[PDB]
Amino acid sequence: PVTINNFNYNDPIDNNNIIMMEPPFARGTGRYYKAFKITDRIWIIPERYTFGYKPEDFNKSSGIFNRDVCEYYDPDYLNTNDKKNIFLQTMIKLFNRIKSKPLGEKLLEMIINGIPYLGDRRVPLEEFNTNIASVTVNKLISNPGEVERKKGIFANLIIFGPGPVLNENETIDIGIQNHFASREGFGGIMQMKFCPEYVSVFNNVQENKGASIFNRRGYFSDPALILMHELIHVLHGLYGIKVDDLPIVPNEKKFFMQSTDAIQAEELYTFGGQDPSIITPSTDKSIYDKVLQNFRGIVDRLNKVLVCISDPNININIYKNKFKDKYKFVEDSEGKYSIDVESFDKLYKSLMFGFTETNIAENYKIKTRASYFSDSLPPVKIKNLLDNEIYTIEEGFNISDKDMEKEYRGQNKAINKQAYEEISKEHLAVYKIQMCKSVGICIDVDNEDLFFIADKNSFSDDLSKNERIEYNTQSNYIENDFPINELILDTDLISKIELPSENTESLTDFNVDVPVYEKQPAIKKIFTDENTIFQYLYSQTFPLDIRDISLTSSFDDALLFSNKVYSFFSMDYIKTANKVVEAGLFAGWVKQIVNDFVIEANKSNTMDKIADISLIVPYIGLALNVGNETAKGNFENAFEIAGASILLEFIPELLIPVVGAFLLESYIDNKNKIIKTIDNALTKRNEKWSDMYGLIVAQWLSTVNTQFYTIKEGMYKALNYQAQALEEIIKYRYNIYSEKEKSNINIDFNDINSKLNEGINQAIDNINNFINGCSVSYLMKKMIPLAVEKLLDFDNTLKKNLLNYIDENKLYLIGSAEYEKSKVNKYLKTIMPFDLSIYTNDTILIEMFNKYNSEILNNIILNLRYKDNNLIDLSGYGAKVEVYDGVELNDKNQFKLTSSANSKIRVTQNQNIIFNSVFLDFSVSFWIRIPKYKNDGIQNYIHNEYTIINCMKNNSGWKISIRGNRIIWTLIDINGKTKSVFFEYNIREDISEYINRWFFVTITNNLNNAKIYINGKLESNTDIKDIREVIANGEIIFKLDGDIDRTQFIWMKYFSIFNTELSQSNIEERYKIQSYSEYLKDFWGNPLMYNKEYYMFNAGNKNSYIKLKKDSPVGEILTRSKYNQNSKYINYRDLYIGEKFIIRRKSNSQSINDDIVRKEDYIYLDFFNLNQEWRVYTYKYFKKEEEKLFLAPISDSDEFYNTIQIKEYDEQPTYSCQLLFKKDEESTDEIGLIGIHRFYESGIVFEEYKDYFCISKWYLKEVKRKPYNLKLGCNWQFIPKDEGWTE
Ligand SMILES: [Zn+2]
Ligand SMILES: [Zn+2]
Secondary structure (H helix, E strand, O other): OOOOOOOOOOOOOOOOOEEEEEOHHHOOOOOOEEEEEEEOOEEEEOOOOOOOOOHHHHOOOOEEOOOOOOEEEOOOOOOOHHHHHHHHHHHHHHHHHHHOOHHHHHHHHHHHHOOOOOOOOOOOOOEEOOOOOOOEEEEEOOOOOOOOOEEEEEOOEEEEOOOOEOOOOEEEOOEEOOEEHHHOOOOOOEEEEOOOOEEOEEOOOOOOOOOOOOOOOOEEOOHHHHHHHHHHHHHHHHOOOOOOOOOEOEOOOOOOEOOOOOEOHHHHHHHOOOHHHHOOHHHHHHHHHHHHHHHHHHHHHHHHOOEEOOOOOOOHHHHHHHHHHHOOOEEOOOOOEEOOHHHHHHHHHHHHHHOOHHHHHHHHOOOOOOOOOOOOOOOEEEOOOOOOOOOEOOOEOOOHHHOOOHHHHHHEOOOOHHHEEOOOHHHEEOOEEEEEOOOOOEEEEEHHHOEOOEOHHHOOOHHHOOEEEOOOOOOOOOOOOOOHHHHHHOOOOOOOOOOOOOEEOOOOOOOOEOOOOOOEEOEEEEEOOOOOHHHHHHOOOOOOOOOOOEEEOOHHHHHHOOOEEEOOOOHHHHHHHOOOOOHHHHHHHHHHHHHHHHHHHHHHHEEEHHHOEEEEOOOHHHHHOOOOOOOOOOHHHHHHHHHHHHHOOOOOOOOOOOOOOEEEOOOOOOHHHHHHHHHHHHHHHHHHHHHHHHHHHHHHHHHHHHHHHHHHHHHHHHHHHHHHHHHHHHHHHHHOOOHHHHHOOOOOHHHHHHHHHHHHHHHHHHHHHHHHHHHHHHHHHHHHHHHHHHHHHHHHHHHHHHHHHHHHOHHHHOOOOOHHHHHHHHHOOOOOOOOHHHOOOOHHHHHHHHHHHHOHHHHEEEEEEEOOOOEEEOOOOOOEEEEOOOOEEOOOOEEEEOOOOOOOEEEEOOOOOOOOOOOOOEEEEEEEEOOOOOHHHHHHHHHOEEEEEEEEEOOEEEEEEEEOOEEEEEEEOOOOOEEEEEEEOOOOOOOOOOOOOOEEEEEEEOOOEEEEEEOOEEEEEEEOOOOOOOOOOOOEEEEEEEOOOOOOOEEEEEEEEEOOOOOHHHHHHHHHHHHOOOEOEOOOOOEOEEOOEEEEEEOOOOOEEEEEOOOOOOEEEEEOOEOOOOOOOOOOEOOOOOOOEEEEEOOOOOOOOOEEOEOOOEEEEEEEEOOEEEEEEEEOOOOOOEEEOEEEEOOOOOOEEOOEEEEOOOOOOOOOEEEEEEOOOOOOOEEEEEEEEEEEEEOOOOEEEEEEEEEEOOHHHHOOOOOOOOOOOOOEEEEOOEOOEOO
């Protein structure tokens, strides 16, 4: 167990537990410091740390020491004995809190027992030397007034009070002659500058600080955790594993980049969580190797140590026994020490991945920041840690007896206000970047607010080096993970070996390197005329001396006038916000504008399913103008085109090394060693793939996800600036009224802020999801594929390398050279799927990833869409698309393939996507419109099959072809085996649902079947179990290829490919999404138009048509004529028959050219009666359920309704539409719907029933029924002449 000593600052010096110490950096000169032994080998010196600092630097100045910290200065801290005593008692309390749990007590025990090796690199291997500044420190025994008498002591840690900056805690190691014992396996006395009262503050982006922007937000740190973070650094230094290696350095070439010190892997390991993932596997191993090497040196020393020249009283055996336990070396029955790989591995992982801030925080139930790379905030002062009502050893601030245990409420700034005090900004110094324009106006931006973008030099290029393979050679993976549970239950973790006595010979060689620090300017001026995120956010603020502002959508005006504030919300929102009303209408106006704010903010949940984008926050570009000028034009469109990439402030240059070649070792005659080499190179190959992915993840996290983090913080600030502006306006307008008026105004400012704040929180959740999705998108589509390219290349090189090796050994391999030759083929055949969980166990990140992978739309690997009279791939995988001159394109995303040789599209797919899942798993979906057969060309139509889409590579692939009325899907595996599935529509139907009409096709392939779906319905199925590997990523050629008629053509739309099998549910949904439109459609499925001649079709009376009756103003209903020739293969009813109708628009007298008919439009239904245009009317005064419609010349009669409202009552896809007669646009009095009715006629000569073009109220209730009745007589379709249909 660990004993924490007790004492008061004024207690007498006893030369044992309370001494007068001579600090290492004092170089054995100057005065001593009263020090207190809080525990064995650990000392507390309650005084400011002054080594390397100038006296005046303890005062706040125009300078700063660290560019990424809001530095608090206070030269009076610890300036009285009572202050010193408070420091002591507080440290005692923190140590008690630390040991209050197993994890912490073990951290302390490891630190107490991790005594520094007696010596360093300059010491002979056969000796212990205690006479060096990193091992021995002196204490003054003599009387006060002379250094006459001193005594030496061994020590592990010396904790001082803070340096100039109170909130800048730091652990320092001792260097001598440019080297550090704590970095070379020996370990050495560690020092620390620490402050328990002024703690750091943080806030989670993906979360919310008690959902209160108007209230204080964020959480303050538990000083016990801050202390344990530093203790972890001490631990590393004591075990001599605080090694340096390739650091993460920030790119600082652009003005928007954040500047900071290089970050060592040891720092990221100490924090834990996701940060270790920013350290690539290559570097993880480099560090591992360096430490192991450090330990080999120590173990050899233990085998060679014979004497201690500096202190004859040192018992060699005791130290050899202690160091053996410290480093976990093993010892044979003779006394020979050696390294036990298993024990070293466990110790290393325990020290680097077990004891971490994140792991300890979780164990002690203390909240901390999400990552090392997260904006730092201004610190706060803790009022009284010594007050058990505010802070306890058992629970810290999160005291259950105060219901502050749940959700870390004790650390919540908005909640536990009695626990802290804000800091005077006058004592704070922050490094700012002054962005000046070439004129002039200047904006100050805190360095913390900028973009942290790791420089390419941050990553190791070790993957480019050659690797020698041997029967020995084994895989090398370092799991940046360690089960904290076992560490806590490790029976032999903590040493049970005697701790040597601390007294020793006084130090006489005070040689040591003392760091020298100095402030740098707190403001750096840079010049740029750019108006990016910083400028846009600034335009949303106003000075403190101003109280009357007005919102504006003009960014430039906002920057120009102090009373003008920029808003990225709607034009309507802005106008309403600046509206001034009378006291009597003020309350109403407040409810209105606040409600509008919520609505505007809520637009963050906008969907864009037609573009295959489930979520889009449309106003982000207007809000920040981040990345590639996202404020100009329409953001949604720009995002559909370029995706996540447009939001990035900078596109990183990735390090993706050409993997080094393998050198296999030969073993002639030795059948085994040769086979082993083959197998080792294979398993090693997988290590390269994994290591490569690791390199990608590290770069994504430190160059890309960091940028997206800044965008999220920016949006949080933007939304708050918007709410603050509105609150300012509301206050101003309210305060213009007199006190008498105010009394009668019903307003609650707390509720206002409550509703605004809630709207913000909802928007933040949406924005967080949107941005995280973008980040993962970039990783998967813009990073991973580039790594796959190199890994695939590597595989090929290694493939020929292995086979060739199997040849040169052909003899020594006898009857197996072939078995292990295919062994290579089948191994290098299957590639390693990328799984982020392998490189990190951060819940937030893993969840982001899993979310992304659960969205079927991310399985889209090809999505050809129209943009600027051209077809391009919007899948994000960058397929190259060449559309040749013979292809016709329109903005309705329709494209036509004709019989011309140049009517072709060439698509070159991305070869770096896991498409070939080995068992064949993918889908193709598209809309198509196939013209009707030519009546005198029916033989060739039914006989000649022609390809329309062909995708082959090495004689393997797939293709879509057509033979008359049949569409065919064909697969051809690597062997040449073939399988087909097809859908054939009938060509003898009176009225067909498919011939020359747009319909939706979807083909899915899995291990077992090949299925064809038509309009969401499964139509065909073919077992493709026997079919082997199918190469599907060759060039896709869209072109009619076969013995076709020169008049043959095909229309297509929305062609897309999924690298997964779509479910019937996914397909149904896609069908409905792509079928959706604000406008009605014609019979062929094209947009319905005004001023276009159409024959009319009735879904409830298919074979009937309308004809103006000869002697009367009515529409008689007749039977359609039919195909008359004698072919046995075809039959149909004529479609171009009956009156030629034409839809005219009612509103806006913009003439009668042409235009799109939209649902709910008011129209006139006319038709041509020879050289005249007649109209369809309804006699106003009928009392029966229905009546015959009145067809006559155009005119305006008081007795007839002439206005029709075109409707769509069906909620499901249909080309049918309905026609409604209402008393007038405004009223809700429905006359009825246009349909067909049967009448009985009995005259002098004829008796029979006849149908007429009518209007009936009966349809009004029927169209409400579910499912929609498609057979209703009020369902009409408009048929215009079309080249795809001849009769
Ligand atoms: Zn640290
Ligand atoms: Zn940062």
